[PDB]
Subunit: 465 residues, 2 copies
């Protein structure tokens, strides 16, 4: 029971309070962006009191994003008073509005798409095919080598971190959608403050083991949850009125950290979100297949990201003389963007240019050495500048490319599954209609759809334009 | 300047306060829907204090309408507490969701459009032509006799009161826009209450004779206004900061009233708004041509409208037995809708079926006679039922179809004219882009565009979609 809608009629309309909310409670696994968004939607649109919403936390203690700006309309900002988050964002965007190769030289064909006619034909072919017919299709299964040599492909694969073995459905969604102050500080903190103002319960030191579901021929109910509250394995019972919102899968789980002298160790340890999705998938076929995302990830995929902080003047002067920025000729496909800068290498199991080791075996100083080499900096003063004038902290994400893995319909469970009474899935791994993963709008849209379907809120979810 | 926008980013975004507004005042001639909308936009979006807003009043005392719902978002309702007007409208429409002939018989081809292929081809050819190429083009210059016999022409000419001699530009706008109790109680009263809450000044017994403008090669300023305050003709001076909003033209002006025994006498008496527009057009050529709307109106056009109230049982029983409703066979093209019913006849100078007199010469009792006649009521008991069991009040509006008269580009002045500093034109007779006249949306959009252009408010006006 939901419907998509557009325009100012359904944007500003406040829905009526759904029936029987006052006897309903909410339990939300995780405290990610989608979880906090769902909590805020339950507080505002669903009118659910703060005492009945529980947020379980593991650790102790662009303009056309319709769902995102719908959510961040009643969320007050924390820096300037009598204003919201969208208010600050709009004011900041109205007050204050690329590729290098051969060690520093800017690309001469910058700005030009350099798309041949056959590449434009293949782009139209990918866009015009149905999503149902693109099940389990790689990027290399739809494009020829003419397109992979174009500068447009370089921009697309660096801006969105795509790979030739990624999902064709998600690239089609990206092409459809994008045809025309990080998130933690700007978005997560205001929602935390708003939820704490409304008195949402936050339970820490909670590791959710699994959720016992019962599946009948007519309706499916989340019957019970086994969690690990502060080390004690215990159980919380559920009714049909006690809704459950699971953020299945996590792209930042099992992320090992490195330092400036040792490399970050690779790992394949499945985390709490992945184990919970696996346990849920054992109960019913329509809960998605986690193994299509968390298993058999190619070793050439993006795994390591580094951050380089420096106060040295001459590196900054070199960067200013140069000018996101992409090293086109690097074997690692290194791309760095803006003090402290952020570096990520796409290919992982390929030897580097200046240091002939893969990014998995390279420590922070080695990454800094090769990034300085590709910046056009001389090879004489390179070593001391990289080792001592700057600090490079790597981090190895083993699941940072899981949302872009090839999927079929049913690999991602629906936001509220068929015949589900009180169980919903949110985050980047919930199947929705015509929205691009790895964006805040995706997580917010999943949270809103979950809340609106579970509570039967009669207000149109803004459709994707 | 101004820019159009769509989506939830610009919908919810509150604009910053424009500079130098604390030294600006506003004077708004008339108290029509557009003037109230402009005052409300100045109060909310312009952040102008109510003491600087003057409303001069003569007499003493569908879902995709983007601009209308943008205006009626912060306006509080009057009937229920803690809700807006849009909230009431949304809740009311979610809680509670034709042609007859030969004296009672419903149309056999009812429901079907019955548009021939040539008619669809003409519709497409009209819709695909640019608006600039249709200057002073009648409806009959673009459609053939095949289109005029379709039931779709019946629906279009009765729903929107179109005529064969009307502007093809406005019909093109209507076809492009709509391809996919009363308004006084629900809209005007809440805005009146909101403005009174904010302290907006209301001057009564004020008759605006004219506005002395000075026009330079670089800018044009409303310098002075000559009005008639309570019978004393006096003058108010203006600065560049004192903005002026004129509702040029009025379709409800100079409306003579009739009764159940005598007809409403036809007239051609120019009202205050038409006189004000005529005084203004003489000063500058780009202020539009009132003579194209207030003069040479064809005598067959819709003039007379009646309201019939009854407490009799059998008439209401007959009405319920029959079932807006259109009498297709009537020579008057009489159409009635729902107690008290409202009757209007498009053709004016043609003898009726039962009474062989035109509607101009027919008194209210006669209108009730022929209306009962076309309803299937027998010709025996008609006279006493029409004269005594119901009361019919007619009214002759001589400008009820002036917005549809054939016009050229520049016949209607711009919402804010080129090189105009403090003079704006709002209402149905102000030229804007891709909006349909004789709608609340048009008046509200003209008000919003005038306020935003004059105050340079950096917020995107919701474009027509």
């Amino acid at each position: 029971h939901m419907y998509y809608s557009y325009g100012n009629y359904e944007a500003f309309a406040r829905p009526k309070k759904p029936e029987n909310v006052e006897n309903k409670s909410a339990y939300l696994i995780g405290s990610g962006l989608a979880s906090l968004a769902a909590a805020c939607f339950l507080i505002r649109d669903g009118q659910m009191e703060g005492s009945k919403i529980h947020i379980l936390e593991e650790l102790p203690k662009e303009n056309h994003f319709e769902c995102l700006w719908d959510l961040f309309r009643s969320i007050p900002s924390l820096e300037i008073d009598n204003a919201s988050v969208l208010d600050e964002f709009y004011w900041l965007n109205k007050e204050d509005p690329r590729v290098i190769e051969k060690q520093g030289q800017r690309l001469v064909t910058d700005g030009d798409f350099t798309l041949t006619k056959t590449a434009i034909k293949e782009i139209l072919d990918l866009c015009l095919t149905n999503e149902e017919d693109l099940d389990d299709v790689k990027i290399t299964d739809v494009f020829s080598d003419d397109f992979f040599n174009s500068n447009f492909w370089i921009y697309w694969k660096t801006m969105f971190a795509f790979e030739p073995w990624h999902s064709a459905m998600e690239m089609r969604r990206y092409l459809m959608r994008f045809v025309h102050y990080n998130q933690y500080e700007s978005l997560v903190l205001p929602m935390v403050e708003y939820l704490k103002s409304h008195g949402v319960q936050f339970e820490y030191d909670v590791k959710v083991e699994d959720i016992k579901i019962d599946v009948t021929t007519s309706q499916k109910i989340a019957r019970e949850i086994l969690i690990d509250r502060n080390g004690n394995a215990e159980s919380i019972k559920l009714t049909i009125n006690d809704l459950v919102f699971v953020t299945n899968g996590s792209i930042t789980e099992s992320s090992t950290y490195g330092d400036n002298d040792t490399p970050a160790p690779p790992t394949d340890e499945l985390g709490g979100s992945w184990t919970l999705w696996k346990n849920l998938a054992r109960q019913s076929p329509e809960f998605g297949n986690p193994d299509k995302f968390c298993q058999n990830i190619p070793k050439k995929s993006w795994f390591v990201s580094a951050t380089s902080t420096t106060n040295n003047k001459e590196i900054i002067d070199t960067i200013e003389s140069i000018c996101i920025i992409t090293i086109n000729d690097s074997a690692w496909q290194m791309s760095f963007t803006i003090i402290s800068t952020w570096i990520y290498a796409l290919y992982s199991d390929v030897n580097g240019d200046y240091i002939k080791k893969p990014i998995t075996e390279c420590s922070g100083n080695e990454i800094c050495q090769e990034w300085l080499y590709h910046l056009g900096v001389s090879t004489d003063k390179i070593e001391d500048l990289a080792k001592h004038a700057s600090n490079t902290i790597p981090v190895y994400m083993p699941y940072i490319t899981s949302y872009f893995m090839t999927r079929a319909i049913g690999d991602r469970p629906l936001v509220v599954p068929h015949q589900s009474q009180n169980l919903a899935f949110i985050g980047n791994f919930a199947e929705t209609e015509r929205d691009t993963v790895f964006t805040t709008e995706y997580s917010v849209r999943t949270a809103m759809e979950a809340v609106y379907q579970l509570l039967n809120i009669d207000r149109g979810i803004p459709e994707v334009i």
